[PDB]
Every structure is written in C-alpha cells, then in structure tokens.
Amino acid sequence: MREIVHIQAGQCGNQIGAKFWEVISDEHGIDPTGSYHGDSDLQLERINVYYNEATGNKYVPRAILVDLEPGTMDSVRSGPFGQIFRPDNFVFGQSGAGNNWAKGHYTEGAELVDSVLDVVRKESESCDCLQGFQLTHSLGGGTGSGMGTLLISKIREEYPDRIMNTFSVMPSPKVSDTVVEPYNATLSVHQLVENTDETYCIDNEALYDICFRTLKLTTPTYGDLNHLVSATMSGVTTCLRFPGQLNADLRKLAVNMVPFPRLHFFMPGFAPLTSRGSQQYRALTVPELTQQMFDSKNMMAACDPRHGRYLTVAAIFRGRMSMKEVDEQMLNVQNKNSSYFVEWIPNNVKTAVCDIPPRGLKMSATFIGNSTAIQELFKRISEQFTAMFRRKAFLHWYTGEGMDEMEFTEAESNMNDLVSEYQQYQDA
C-alpha cells in the first residue's frame, strides 16, 4: 500500500489541486523543476505515495489533470509549480460543460473519459502496490461534478478492489456561480454515496464564514478560500506522506472511520486558522489546538457538531510537542463532552503526532470527523433543490441533454435517505 493516483477535475478541482501539490512539494523539499533540495531524510521515506521516481533523481507527481475547458489547465501550466506535472497527464476537451452536470456526465464528458482512463491505466501499471485514487473537484459545476463522478463510476469498474477517496467542494449561495448548483450537487451526492469510500466535505459556505467572521477579510476571493482548502488537504494527508507510530493507509482509514458503508462523509477541521501572507508569531499551546480543532468555527463544513453526535474521529497534531500532553488534552475533550460521542463505538477517537510542522506554523492540528451533524449540509442542498424542482425550473438545460425528470426524483430520494440514515444514529 504505497502509491496513490491523484485526479483533479474542472475549474475548482484543478485550482485546489494545484495548491495541494504546491504545499506538499514544499513539505517534501521539491522545487518547481522536480529536484529534491530538502535537508531531512524523513521527507523522502514515504515520497513514493504521491510521487513517481524518475531518472536523474527527478520526482514527478502522480497527478492527472482533467477538464472539458482548456482555460484553467493553461493557468496551472503557466502557474508557480506547473512545470512539475507530467505533460502527458494533461487531458482536456474544448467545448466545456457550461455548469451542467448532464454535459459532464452524459454528453461532453463521455467523449473525453476514455482518454483520462488511458492515462490512469498508464499510471496504475507503474505501481508496486496501488493504494487507490483521490479526486479533487467541486459538486456545483459541470466538469468536476458530472464528469468527475463519471470517472469514479468507471474507475470502480476497472479497479473494484481499490479505495476511492474524494475532496468534494460543496456549493453555497454565499459563493455562487449559477442557480443550478443545487441540482448539480444532488446528482453528484447520489453518485458519491454509492461509489466512494471516503469523502471530505469541503463546504464553500464554511470557508466564506471563516474568512469573514474569523480571518477578518470583508470580501474574500477564491484564493483565500483555497488557502484554507490546501492547509486542510496537507493535514489530512500528513499520515500517508510521513512515517509515524502507525503505518497509515487509505483502507485502514476507511475500516476505522466508516461504521456503515453509506456514512462516509467527513467534516474536516483545522487549527490554527490563518489568513494569507500575514503570520501569527505566537505558537499555540497543546490545550489551545485541542479546543480550536473541535470548535465549530474551525470546521470546513458549515455544520454545528453540537447538533449531532460523533461516530468516529481522527486527529493529527503537527510539530514538536509533548505527546503526553496531546493524550491528556484529547482525553479531556472526550470526558468533558461525552454525550457528543456515540457510546456504541468504544474508543472512537484516534490521535497521531507528526514531528514535521507545515510551512509558517510551529505547531498545528487537523481534524477528521464522521459526525451525524453533516446531515445539515445535505438538508441545505435538499431545501435549495426542492425550491426549484417543485416548479421544474431550469430543468430544460438537463432534459435537452437526454436526462429524465425521474433521475432527479431518484437523486432527491437517495440524499433524503442519507439524511434520515444519519438521523437514525443521532438518536440511537
């Protein structure tokens, strides 16, 4: 269980994906040309997880860049780290998906999908032991949403015994491109519920609110939102990328986080919350990290954890600190707030400490929670969906691409089922 194949799809998928490779290449000591210029041997011990060995010691990201529009992918190639990516792994169409799920899934995306799978297959054949796949995408547009889920469905056919992992960006009227985003998201969730092992629910509502209420930025751009995304993406992958007490892989994470196969939607969280450029000079104490990471204000999904119960929790502390104090604080939170953790999964919180801190911070904490509070996110999408769907509004964009009204009704039903499934274990 070594190699992970990273796929990034659509505008959002490629933009957060580029930031991910930018951040982790700095952490592993790789420059924008592919050469290792780090000082610690601990940086290279698990580099094969995300990077492919090359002649001359060059390191290349195991990354496939997918879009139906060439626009965003040219922005990556001309961007800060764009030269590092294997040029063949740039797979693009010309027309675009026009924020339409049907175009991504059924028409425009179908034309391009086999080309991506040829690049996937070529990357998979190099692998000593392929761990699985991770996708970065939004659920509100057309490519990342529609084509992204078409890829997942096709990958699961060719590799049925591998882990499927997503970083899925949830749409919000606060950071909105089109009115059809709740349609695109509901159709995507329907696919994610069936075809993924793990989904990190990154809510654009939450990322806006963190930028507005906490980071003090009055009008935040996508860059400020993606700073929060990439920092969370760094933290959740730390254990896969670095040696620790545990030999950490995607399957072990799935076995331990997912008690019931449909309930695999995770609330990410980060501490401390930082804005771009400007640095905090005071390092947080271990009690401060523990209090903040469990705080709702630090959650990447706009759900109040006090409205639900925690099924399973994974926490990761980064930096040189007392592992005894980490254990003491983690146990303190559980014993002070025992009602918010299900009694029917004993010892549902696991904690790891990595010595290497991320760029700019001396010590930090990353939170991964399978809470029943995530239902609020799915209810919000469901409410926005129904408001339009009861009048069959904007539906002609989808019926014109061959889709039936029944498929919308089915997707509405499955998501509402997921909501009631999460509600079942909140009261149990």
Partner: protein, 437 residues
C-alpha cells in the same frame, strides 16, 4: 532434547519476536553474527539451548523462528537490522498488502494466498528437528494479520502436527496504544477459532505493560520498544526452563500438566517483579520475601484483574537470581497468612517453584536495571475472566448496531460467525463462573 519452533505473526508478533531473540542471544552469549564462543561442540549437539537454536558447520547458531507478516515494512527492519546475519531469509516471510485491521481479510482473503507458503517454510524447520515437541506462537488479538492469519495457521498446524503442543503469547488490546477501533471484533473472532487449537495461552494486556512503564520505569509516554523490552523479560522467564538445565517445565507438555487442568480454561495470569528504572540513582535491592509478595499485587500483573475475588487452579513461581528454597518457603508462609489466596476444592493449595541461579539479563542501554533476584509468577486464576468480560461488553456495544460488520461480510465472512464467536465467549465466561464461585 526436543526442539521448539517460534512463529511470529503480524507487527506485534514480529517486534516482540525481535525483542525476545535479542534477549536470548545475550543470555546464551550468542553474538549478532551467530557465533557462540562458549559452545564447544561445533556444528552440532543436543544441549538445552538447541531447543531454540539449530547449528551450521561454520558455527552459526540460527533461531528456530519463522517471522510472517502480510506487509513488508516491519520484517524489512529485521532484514536490515543488527540481527540480520542471525536469520536466513527463508525464515522471514512478507506479503504485499496487509489485512487492514480486518480479521476476515487476514483469515479468508489474504490468508488463502499465503497459508501454503508459510506451512512449507515451517516444514523446512520441522525437518531439521530430531524430535519436535511443538510451537510457540506470538501475535496480537487486535490486528488483522495478528487475529485472522494466526487463527488459520492454528487450524492448519493442528492438522499437519496433531501430536505437537501449541503455546500462545497474545497481545490483548488497550485503547492507550490501540491501532484500530475494530479490535474487540478481531479479538473475539480469533479466540473462538483458536480456543480448540491452543494448549496454553499467555495474555498480555498492553494497558498493564504501559502503566508498569509509567509507574516503575518513569517513562512519560511508553513506545513499543519500551513495552517489548519488558514483555520479552516476561517471555524469557516463561521459556527459560526450556532453554536451560532444570526440572520444572522442561517440555511444552508440562505447561499443560502444571497450569491447565480444564482444557478450555487455558489462560494463566503472569505476574513479574521487580521492574526497576535503570536511570534511578540509589536502589535498595529487594529480597525474596518482597518480590514474592509483589507477585500478588494487581499493579505487577500482565492483565489487570483481582485474584482475591476468584479461585486458583495452579501456581508456578519462577525465580531468576540469588534465591534459595529456604527463603522461598519462608516468604510463602508469611504471604499465605496475610493475603486472600483461595484454591478450587478439586486442587491442592500449593506452588511449583523453579529457580535459575543466573540473574536476569537486561539489554545494555535499556530502561530496566540489573537486579540480584527476580520472579515471574504464573497462576491459573478465574479472575482473568474480567478481561473477557471487558472485551465482550465492548463487542456487544458495537455489534448491537451492526457497526463495521459490513467490512467483514465484504471479505466473504457471514454475519452468523459474529454471533457464533460471541456465543462461545458467553460459554467461556460461564465456565469461569462455575469454577469461580
């Protein structure tokens, strides 16, 4: 002379295996290259250490050990480690992908594709034996390989070597050190499949070892190395009588005879004293009376439980160091009057004592101080059922909601096996209850 084969399964089994073989080598004066200066019969012999070591014409002493993990990482550190020359690569078996904390994945899925290879390498060691008596099996209850594969191995060893004894060294799961949340599932599943196939099993609760390291070794946050060096001392004490001249527990069959009258109730409690920090300046050396008294303190046991609220069936005292029979009997007499020691009506109230004059060996630079005298007590008490009750309650909490069950079923297992394994455990808890009060 009758040879013993050690099998080390999964991470816990392998790393504890490494800790033990390191200690055995220091005890018998065997160097990391395998040369033993004190050994005079070059390339042969049937001495007491030959139970655990075979020989080559060159003069190398090779362990009768097989290391097996479904994942390369851990055994790769044995292949590259300071004891690389000691083993031949055929003894060290690795897979590609691990059992992902899943009993069913280790038993059914990944178990099937490696079982025949492992038994072949075990047969390779068994053919070198003039009269093999059986197997010592090292594993964890909690891990997928440790639970799943070990139970399939125990199934097959009973078929291929029906005449031979099988002893277990098992790591009972503790939340302070645990890898996975499904460890109660794996523990119950593996015990059910292994119960008929195991003659004697020594449970080691990671919680007990952890807290001993905090209290007595002054280690703030114990690592596996801290735990394993301590576990290896206890294992060494138990195996000492097979590796040295003596008359108590000389073969593996005697472990059954001395400690196990009821075949299902084959889990002796181990207690060890004394555990003293090496970085402790000025230590008053503890006497025979003091260390024997410490064998009846719950804080020194390998599993936390209360022997006062239970009954004994057997009791072995194994001393290492400056100990004479007179001091032992004096100690026993004082302890009997001052403590609650109750035996079952169908057993003699008494102790079987073994003394080895060589003081315990500690690894140089380790956390344990050199002591003049030490003792391991092995007692078959009904009190150890507390550990089964703890584990069963955690199992019942998860299984009532059918949590995580789909991972096991997804690997080919049936939901019925969960309740079958739990019914056997419920039967075992009743067995201890009847004998108990």
């Amino acid at each position: 002379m009758r040879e013993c084969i050690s099998i080390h399964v999964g991470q816990a089994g392998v790393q504890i295996g490494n800790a033990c073989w390191e200690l055995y080598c220091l005890e018998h004066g065997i160097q990391p290259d395998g040369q033993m200066p004190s050994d005079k019969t070059i390339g042969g012999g049937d001495d007491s250490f030959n139970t655990f070591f075979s020989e080559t014409g060159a003069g190398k002493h090779v362990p009768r050990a097989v290391f097996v993990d479904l994942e390369p990482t851990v055994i790769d550190e044995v292949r590259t480690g300071t004891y690389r020359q000691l083993f031949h690569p055929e003894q060290l078996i690795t897979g590609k992908e691990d059992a992902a904390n899943n009993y069913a994945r280790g038993h059914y899925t990944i178990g099937k594709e490696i079982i025949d290879l492992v038994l072949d390498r075990i047969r390779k060691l068994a053919d070198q034996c003039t009269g093999l008596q059986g197997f010592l099996v090292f594993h964890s209850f909690g891990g997928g390989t440790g639970s799943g594969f070990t139970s399939l191995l125990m199934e097959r060893l009973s078929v291929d070597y029906g005449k031979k004894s099988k002893l277990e060294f098992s790591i009972y799961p503790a939340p302070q050190v645990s890898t996975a949340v499904v460890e109660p599932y794996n523990s119950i599943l593996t015990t059910h499949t292994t119960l008929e196939h195991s003659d004697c099993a020594f449970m080691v609760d990671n919680e007990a070892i952890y807290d001993i390291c905090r209290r007595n070794l002054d280690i703030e946050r114990p690592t596996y190395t801290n735990l394993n060096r301590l576990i290896s001392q206890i294992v060494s004490s138990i195996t000492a009588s097979l590796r040295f001249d003596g008359a108590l527990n000389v073969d593996l069959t005697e472990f059954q005879t001395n400690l196990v009258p009821y075949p299902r109730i084959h889990f002796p409690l181990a207690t060890y004293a004394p555990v003293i920090s090496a970085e402790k300046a000025y230590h008053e050396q503890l006497s025979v009376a003091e260390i024997t008294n410490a064998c009846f303190e719950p804080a020194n046991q390998m599993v936390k439980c209360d022997p006062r609220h239970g009954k004994y069936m057997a009791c072995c005292l194994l001393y290492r160091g400056d100990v004479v029979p007179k001091d032992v009997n004096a100690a026993i007499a004082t302890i009997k009057t001052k403590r609650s020691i109750q035996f079952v009506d169908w057993c003699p109230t008494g102790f079987k004592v073994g003394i080895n004059y060589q003081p315990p060996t500690v690894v140089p630079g380790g956390d344990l101080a050199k002591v003049q005298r030490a003792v391991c007590m092995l007692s078959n008490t009904t009190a150890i059922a507390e550990a089964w009750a703890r584990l069963d309650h955690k199992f019942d909490l998860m299984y009532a909601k059918r949590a995580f069950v789909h991972w096991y079923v997804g690997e080919g297992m049936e939901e019925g096996e969960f309740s079958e394994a739990r019914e056997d455990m419920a039967a075992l808890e009743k067995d201890y209850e009847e004998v108990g009060v």
